[PDB]
Amino acid sequence: RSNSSPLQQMTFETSFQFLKQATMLGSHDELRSPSACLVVGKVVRGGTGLFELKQPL
């Protein structure tokens, strides 16, 4: 409950209570957890994905 990720926290347990909460509070998700990053099809923010590559022109 003391967690800043609605997409996490609903991939764990009691997903409908945590969805009702996140919905009646307008709770915003930053897509920084591994779960929130695998739900919307992003690259996790640890290990190999932690930096850019920035090909110079």
Binding site: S5, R32, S33, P34, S35, G46, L50
Partner: protein
């Protein structure tokens, strides 16, 4: 009573294992094939080697001897409230010369509780691990060596309280320096090389440790309430 009974029986087994297993075997360790398989770590144990020869042991189901019936007998073959250790699951037979029917029964009880416990234990462990993994998953080491969560909350300011991930700290223990010293030429050529050793400048950290050492020299008892006044 159960506990103070699995004791006279255990005195006789010690006397029984010692009689046969070390030197009562027909062939000894260099030339025995069972020893030299449990003794070199290939497969098995001295308690498997025994329990194949000279004793099977005291059966224990829930940490206790086999349960009694509602009339006070542990098995239809045994009088009610029979004192012999045999009636309580003390198997003196070995797999070399098989075990009798009553001992077979207790051994099956034990072997079956083992499987039941395996199933239930795994059922609980899976859930424990799922919960743990679902909470500590976003903690990664950052480029400032601090262990932060997904939202930036600093959990630790240094991973192990010193950094130093586990697999690499195996030879940094003492008692492994006489190895790094013996293999110094290979270690410098193969990894660090003369290049890194001379591209190192230790003054800032070395002076800090000198200051710490001087302080600890002037204050042997570091719990003595230092103060100006």
């Amino acid at each position: 009573i159960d506990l103070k009974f699995k004791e006279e029986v255990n005195h006789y087994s010690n006397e029984i294992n010692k009689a046969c297993m070390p030197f009562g075997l027909h062939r000894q360790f260099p030339e025995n094939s069972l020893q030299m398989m449990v003794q070199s770590g290939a497969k098995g144990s001295t308690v498997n080697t025994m329990q194949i020869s000279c004793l099977l042991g005291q059966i224990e189901l829930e940490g206790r001897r086999p349960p009694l019936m509602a009339s006070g007998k542990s098995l239809p073959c045994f009088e009610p409230y029979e004192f012999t250790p045999r009636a309580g699951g003390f198997v003196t037979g070995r797999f070399l010369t098989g075990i009798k029917p009553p001992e077979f029964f207790f051994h099956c009880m034990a072997g079956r509780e083992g499987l039941v416990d395996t199933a239930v234990k795994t059922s609980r462990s899976g859930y424990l691990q799922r919960c743990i993994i679902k909470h500590l998953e976003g903690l990664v080491v950052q480029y400032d060596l601090t262990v932060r969560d997904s939202d930036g909350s600093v959990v630790q300011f240094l991973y192990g309280e010193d950094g130093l991930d586990i697999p690499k700290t195996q030879f940094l223990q003492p008692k492994q320096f006489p190895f790094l010293a013996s293999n110094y030429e290979v270690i410098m050529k193969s990894q660090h090389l003369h290049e890194v050793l001379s591209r190192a400048d230790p003054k800032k950290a070395l002076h800090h440790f000198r200051a710490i050492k001087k302080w600890q020299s002037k204050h042997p008892n570091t719990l003595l309430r230092r103060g100006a006044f």
